[PDB]
Amino acid sequence: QDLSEALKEATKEVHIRAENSEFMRNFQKGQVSREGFKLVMASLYHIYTALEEEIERNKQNPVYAPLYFPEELHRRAALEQDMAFWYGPHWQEAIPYTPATQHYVKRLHEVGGTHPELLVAHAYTRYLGDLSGGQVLKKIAQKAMALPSSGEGLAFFTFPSIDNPTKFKQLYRARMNTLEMTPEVKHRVTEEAKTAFLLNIELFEELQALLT
Numbered sequence: 001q002d003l004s005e006a007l008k009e010a011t012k013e014v015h016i017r018a019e020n021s022e023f024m025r026n027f028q029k030g031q032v033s034r035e036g037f038k039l040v041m042a043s044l045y046h047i048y049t050a051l052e053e054e055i056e057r058n059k060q061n062p063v064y065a066p067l068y069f070p071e072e073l074h075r076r077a078a079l080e081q082d083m084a085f086w087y088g089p090h091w092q093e094a095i096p097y098t099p100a101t102q103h104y105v106k107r108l109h110e111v112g113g114t115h116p117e118l119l120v121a122h123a124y125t126r127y128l129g130d131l132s133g134g135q136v137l138k139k140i141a142q143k144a145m146a147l148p149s150s151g152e153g154l155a156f157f158t159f160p161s162i163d164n165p166t167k168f169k170q171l172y173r174a175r176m177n178t179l180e181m182t183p184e185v186k187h188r189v190t191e192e193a194k195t196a197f198l199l200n201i202e203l204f205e206e207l208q209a210l211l212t
């Protein structure tokens with residue numbers, strides 16, 4: 001079974017629970033406010049920063065290299081623009097760093113530093129989600145908070161180097177299937193992807209609580 005297929009099959013159930021988490025439900029209903037949005041984007045700032053830092057550390061490692069797409073996918077620079085937009089010039093010392101965010105970041109560094117062969121599970125989970133559900137949330141965000149079509153405040157949800165996200169995802173799935181793969185690695189990779197989803201679910205539950 002191809003890795004791409006193994007991953008989709010392995011995370012399809014937790015994906016359902018993830019997109020139906022309270023925070024995402026309210027978001028999809030359009031009940032998302034500036035406070036909540038700023039909180040989740042700041043958290044994403046930390047997460048992608050850690051993720052992309054580990055990607056750089058392993059860009060030349062064969063167990064990840066085929067998926068090294070900084071120009072097309074990386075979100076840190078975009079998140080930094082969004083942070084300046086929502087938090088101002090000194091967003092650096094203004095943004096929050098929640099426990100659930102720290103937990104996620106912690107795992108990202110363990111993987112990147114000790115289990116680089118599992119890093120693909122974390123890139124897959126975040127990036128392909130960004131190119132799928134994230135695009136739907138983008139429209140909802142714009143309508144709900146009156147964000148300009150010009151993109152300010154939503155740079156994270158914008159991929160200027162990707163013309164067709166659908167075609168890109170196809171490319172990415174096929175590229176995932178070129179990675180050296182053994183039963184041991186395939187099993188663990190799909191397992192780490194489920195973990196990635198859970199870390200996300202826990203972030204949402206934490207953020208939802210903080211808002212209430």
Ligand code: HEM
Nearest residue numbers: 007008018019024124125126128129132133136137169200
């Ligand atoms: C906001 C609610 C969400 C919606 C509306 C949504 C919807 C979708 C849709 C329509 C697809 C299928 C696209 C395709 O086959 O190319 C998809 C794929 C995916 N989503 Fe979500 N999603 C949501 C939340 C999430 C979250 C929270 C994550 C994890 C951070 C996530 C990660 C993924 C991944 C990894 C894929 C690619 C699966 C694959 O083709 O292998 N999604 N999503």
